[PDB]
């Protein structure tokens with residue numbers, strides 16, 4: 001019973017979380033997952049400020065109200081070569097990665113590693129935070145409050 005959560009640098013408190021190395025998070029699960037990091041789904045304004053500080057990914061993820069990819073450098077295989085906060089318009093499917101926003105993080109680029117999952121609750125799952133540099137933090141718990149996400 002294990003879940004891997006790959007996380008990034010934070011930019012103005014905004015970071016990306018990928019579950020189990022594939023697009024696998026529902027919108028309800030995303031809100032619960034950010035809550036386990038004492039975080040919330042970013043607003044569009046918070047994501048645009050993060051982009052301006054250097055944030056970009058090549059993966060779709062939830063924010064409040066939309067599914068997006070922040071892009072700085074045009075790349076043909078990331079958001080169809082667009083720059084800015086690219087918004088997903090048409091998709092058949094419901095599961096993506098997520099973005100989270102931690103208001104207590106540093107104001108600009110914070111590329112230190114994540115070493116805690118502070119607000120997870122008691123549960124049976126081994127949850128492992130995987131940083132881009134490979135460093136890991138694991139703890140037994142749960143963060144999903146909706147049965148359909150388990």
Ligand SMILES: CC(C)NC(=O)N(C)[C@@H]1CCS(=O)(=O)C1
Pocket residue numbers: 006130131132133134
């Ligand atoms: C170039 C990017 C996609 N590579 C990347 O993120 N990785 C190789 C991951 C670092 C930690 S891991 O989760 O074990 C695999």
